[PDB]
């Protein structure tokens, strides 16, 4: 092939993220920003 072939999957992720940005709350998002996320915390939220 001519390159890697997961850019399609990234495009699908982009399409869903752009619409998913609207369903986010604010007042208790700022506190999440205040909280220090680190390597331990960031990826523990995966689905399963």
């Amino acid at each position: 092939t001519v390159r890697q072939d997961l850019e399609r999957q990234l495009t699908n992720l982009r399409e869903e993220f752009n619409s998913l940005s609207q369903e986010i709350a604010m007042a208790q998002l700022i506190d999440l920003a205040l909280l220090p996320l680190d390597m331990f915390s960031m990826f523990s939220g995966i689905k399963s």
């Binding site: 092939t1 001519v2 072939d5 399609r8």
Partner: protein, 276 residues
Amino acid sequence: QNYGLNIPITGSMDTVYSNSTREEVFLTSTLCLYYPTEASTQISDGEWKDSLSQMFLIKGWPTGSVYFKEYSNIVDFSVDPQLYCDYNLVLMKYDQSLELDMSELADLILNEWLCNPMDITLYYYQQSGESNKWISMGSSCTVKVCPLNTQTLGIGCQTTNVDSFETVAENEKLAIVDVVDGINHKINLTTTTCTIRNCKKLGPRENVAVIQVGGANILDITADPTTNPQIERMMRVNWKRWWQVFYTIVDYINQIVQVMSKRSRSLNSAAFYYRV
């Protein structure tokens, strides 16, 4: 310097119209016809080029400006149609079973395509989006595709056994093929005769107009099925006598060029921008 592409042109809504320009566009442009060999055969002449040129002169075009070109038929004209010429009018006779190839030729010449090469034997090829196609032109373009999954193994077909490949267009002189966008493919295309280019579709080549001569409007220039727009450059005139057809063209040439435009001409007579 750019020509000013990113600068606005403040206009006005009270400036008076400048006067006509039909005379100047006639005296500058060059009208140009593409007609089948059947037309000359039925006309049974050979001073008819001269007669039509003098008729155009009476209509208001200087002498060395109307150029006639002859092609054997639609499918054979489809193999590398080079519009060598300024205002193109492609007379096109309808007959059953030529719906798709006639539509493909109309698409190819009406729209501007930016084409890149493809090395079929080596690399797999995707289609980026809605505007991309693969255009295959030559003496015998039989195209067989095998789509590959995430594991580079074909789905419904094995890359080794060419019989299992899904044929998508067989024995056409021109084939504009679309495939699901985002899947690598292995193509088996007869490299000796046919050549296949990966072509994006830019805006419309708003210079060439297509005059269908026979049946009902069928030209679906837009490969997408949800939309079948009718361009003003796609004309349709019934016929029995080629002389009557040519006289209609000569009589109504002013309206046809008024529909067409001159600025959308390319230096190359090729019907696409080859960008290597």
